């Protein structure tokens, strides 16, 4: 998971990211992702700022659809 999580935020480079896209495709690509227990989000979201160590916005006002989320991370 952290690894998928360490290419998953490599989607970026260290400015930000979409979690929504990140797990967008984290489950458009794992399938045993999708056919397990969709509620990793929170462990995973978590361990997210706490691999990183980023920062993250609540949910601003930029989500296509209503269901996304921009996260600021840098080095």
Same mark, same amino acid.
């Given at each position: 998971?952290? #690894?998928l999580?360490?290419? #998953?935020?490599?989607? =970026? #480079?260290?400015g930000?990211?979409?979690? #929504?896209?990140?797990?967008? /495709?984290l489950?458009?690509?794992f !399938?045993?992702?999708r056919? =397990? /227990?969709?509620? +990793?989000?929170?462990s995973?979201?978590?361990?997210? $700022? @706490?691999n990183?160590?980023?920062?993250?916005? @609540?949910?601003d006002p $930029?989500?296509? +659809?209503?269901?996304?989320?921009? +996260?600021?991370?840098? !080095?």
């Amino acid at each position: 998971y952290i #690894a998928l999580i360490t290419m #998953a935020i490599r989607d =970026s #480079a260290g400015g930000r990211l979409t979690l #929504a896209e990140i797990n967008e /495709y984290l489950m458009g690509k794992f !399938p045993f992702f999708r056919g =397990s /227990y969709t509620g +990793w989000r929170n462990s995973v979201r978590h361990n997210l $700022s @706490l691999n990183d160590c980023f920062v993250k916005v @609540l949910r601003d006002p $930029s989500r296509p +659809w209503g269901k996304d989320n921009y +996260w600021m991370l840098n !080095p």
